[PDB]
Design a protein around this nucleic acid. Sequence first.
RNA 1: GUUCCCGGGCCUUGUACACACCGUAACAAGGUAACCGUAGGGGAACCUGCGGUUGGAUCACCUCCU
RNA 2: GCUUGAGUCUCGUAGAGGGGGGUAGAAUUCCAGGUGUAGCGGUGAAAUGCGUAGAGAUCUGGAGGAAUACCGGUGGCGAAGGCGGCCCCCUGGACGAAGACUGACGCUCAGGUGCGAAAGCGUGGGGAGCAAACAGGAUUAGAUACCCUGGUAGUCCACGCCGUAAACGAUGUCGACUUGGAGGUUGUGCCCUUGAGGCGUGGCUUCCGGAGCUAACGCGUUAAGUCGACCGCCUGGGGAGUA
Lengths: 49, 88, 65, 100, 65, 116
Amino acid sequence: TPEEKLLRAIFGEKASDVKDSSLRVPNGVSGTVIDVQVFTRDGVEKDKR
Amino acid sequence: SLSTEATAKIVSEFGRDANDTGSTEVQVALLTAQINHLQGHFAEHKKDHHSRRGLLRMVSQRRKLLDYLKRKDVARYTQLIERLGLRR
Amino acid sequence: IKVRENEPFDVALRRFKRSCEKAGVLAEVRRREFYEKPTTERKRAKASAVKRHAKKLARENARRT
Amino acid sequence: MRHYEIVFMVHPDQSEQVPGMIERYTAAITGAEGKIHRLEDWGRRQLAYPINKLHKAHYVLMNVEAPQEVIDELETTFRFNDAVIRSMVMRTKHAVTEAS
Amino acid sequence: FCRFTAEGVQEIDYKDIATLKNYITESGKIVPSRITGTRAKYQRQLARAIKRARYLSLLPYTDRH
Amino acid sequence: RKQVSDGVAHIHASFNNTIVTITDRQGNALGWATAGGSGFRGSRKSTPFAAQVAAERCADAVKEYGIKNLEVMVKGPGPGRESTIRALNAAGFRITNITDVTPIPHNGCRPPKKRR
RNA sequence: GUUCCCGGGCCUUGUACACACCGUAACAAGGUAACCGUAGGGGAACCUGCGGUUGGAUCACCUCCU
RNA sequence: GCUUGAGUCUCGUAGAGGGGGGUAGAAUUCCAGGUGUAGCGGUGAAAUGCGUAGAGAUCUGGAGGAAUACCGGUGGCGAAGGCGGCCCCCUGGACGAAGACUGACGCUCAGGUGCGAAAGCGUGGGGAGCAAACAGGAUUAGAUACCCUGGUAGUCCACGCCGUAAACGAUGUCGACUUGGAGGUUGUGCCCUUGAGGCGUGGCUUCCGGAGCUAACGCGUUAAGUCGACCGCCUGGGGAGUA
């Protein structure tokens, strides 16, 4: 909206653009995460984990 | 803005409680305490055409407060002028 | 202040300079001070600044033209 | 007694001997009522405008709890030290801990 | 309307200037309390802190002298 | 001469005069051009067309020096500031960057006075 | 085609005018807005500097971003 | 004797509020040095002045002097006047949640006392910019008048004197009462401040309106509406707010 295009170009580069659309725990399950299989970008590493 | 751990000592002396600073004998003393730390400014700086309105204000308030205690309780007033020495 | 742009110009591009002040401080430090002046003219300016909003309130209720 | 936020800076030249100079100032506080809250070391980061010639100074923040009459004379020292060029002392309020 | 003055409480500091870039322009010009959706209190306190950031060489005056 | 590539053209437009002074980054001036030194005496100096003739008198007197990637350091948003920077970008110059280096005063001293 | 030029009408702004537009300082923005306070000066109105206020006038056009 | 009046404390905030001193940076007048040109400046126009004794212009170093663009908001402080960088110390006034009290300690005025922008002057210093008296060139029949270049007084720091105003939101002051909206500025209490808020309460200020007043415009919880308390002023203009 026009009342958030102006406020958008002030409070940073990414104010109200990036949202939270994460991968969530499947609805209806109660378990325990044991191992994490990660694949870093082919060429550039991740951050720390 | 005032010296709290000196004035709280005063309400401790004059007051029969710690919350009782509504009695004439205690309030005029807290007013004189203000004047005791006010001398420090009317000795220096010289150009206080603004701070002058504070002098005349608190002195007026004080002159008439001790002017009523005088007209009602000469027991507390003579004890007050003999307890703080706010006469001279 | 400083515009550059490596190649896609074919123009000078001094649009942020004007978008900065340009005449903003030119009109304020070029002639005599006269401390009170702006205050009075911002007066007529402010009343006419509320007037267009008064025109916004003058277009919403009727205008059955 | 009072919460202070002494934020001073030095030139990169004295940046290799200022750690010793921080021990200089914090010596006083320690033996005369004091405890530090946030000693920050940023490094020789980019300055704004060149200080008469060279840019990029060494930032050192203290933000220590100290007495008012000591910091009075302590800022006098900042005023005439060759490491510290510019400083800034604060009033009371809250004590910091992160700022990063 | 923004998710920053909905989590912004009690005097924004003068140390790291990354968010001060979000109130000033890339010229050295400050935005008024009306453009930025921020009560005068805040846009003004940020401002005073910035003048002190000039006495500390965090931000310069205008871009170039 | 000078072996300069960075021709710093200081374009200063007062009110009724466009005086451009090409120099070096060090200050070694090369010469100048003006809306009043080419003629146009009167409200004619007030026109950017005279400032256009100005940017041309400044476009020359540099063919012995050799400015190519020049810097346009503007101050004085009077008669010029428009058809002067544009005249240089039309005189065959590859301006690396047009600079508006204005060390504006906080109005410390008291300035002159005009139209009353 | 109404932006040039002569005359006309409507709406509108403005007036200490309605007996009705030796020097112009106020009344249209009188083409230099006004008045009070203070010092000084010049045949003289008034002017110059400093502080304040509204018992002042248009915010209409010409170039750029949606 | 008792409390809705006045007032203070415990617990806090904000501020062109004042005061003494010190400091940062830009611009300007000017000085030294390298480069370099014949114009700069000004106005409707011309001109005084400067210029090969090299001005204006550019970069570096720098000493006096006064003042704070952008943050700036019919916004904030105050009895009023008046007042815009930052720091250290001093400090008056205004306001609020929850309690504790003497118990009307409240309001105002002739004589009286204090503040008093700016200006005049005395005195120890000062003079960048502007600029009373005045000089040159023009508009002009004339210039001691719009303009430009110079320039004494003044402007500033500190102590005093005559003690003045459109010292005017022209609205005297303490206080109580009287359907709302757009707001702005500064705090606070309650609910999950999840959140950019909802419900009340005080200070200052602006616009449109009801009650009411009024010649009218309009003021309109900051009143010119309704009362009480205290003081000054007017009896047509001028003379004169003068000897």
